[PDB]
RNA sequence: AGGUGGUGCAUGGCUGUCGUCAGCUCGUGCCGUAAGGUGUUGGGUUAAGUCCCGCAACGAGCGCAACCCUCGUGUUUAGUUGC
């Protein structure tokens, strides 16, 4: 058991909290306080942008725009690769190659020579 | 008309030379105010930016290679002034 039965049961468990002095200066107002080395990020903040980013992608998704989902590290890769395919949008896996996301008129052409 | 008279530091054509060395560049996209750079760097590897990996680089063009000519094996076809 926990407190609630919300979205706020599943992000107190342990999906919260990352860097160890390795922090950014400039996203100061999104956290609570430093408990043994680790930054613990704000939960009461994390809900509020969570909204926001969460009403403009429904705002884009009834009109019928196309997504992309981008990730190249090895510890999220498998979850990346997973989440596109059932939303039938752009991802990103294996090594990064310069110019994808600007250059998609020279790296579709390598698309097209591996069904040629 | 004629000039093997001057000037190839006025020139065409052609040549040696480094070199057969292997480099020389471009499109799109990024980096920097910009001139430019990145790709043509790095780690190894080959005669060779040859190739692999890494990497805002991704691809391509000239060069390298190959395609052409002989030599080394055989096979098929045709035999004189050949055997």
Sequence with gaps: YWNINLEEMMEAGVHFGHGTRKW????????????????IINLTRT???????????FDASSRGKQFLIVGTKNKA????????????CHYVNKKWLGGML?????????LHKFRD
Excluded: Q
């Design 24 to 39: 950014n200066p400039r996203m100061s107002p999104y956290i609570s306080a430093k408990c043994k080395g680790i930054h």
């Design 47 to 57: 809900a509020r942008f969570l909204s926001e980013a969460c009403d403009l992608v």
């Design 77 to 88: 890769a498998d979850s990346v690769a997973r989440a596109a395919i059932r939303a039938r």
């Design 102 to 110: 600007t250059n998609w008129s020279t790296t579709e052409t390598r």
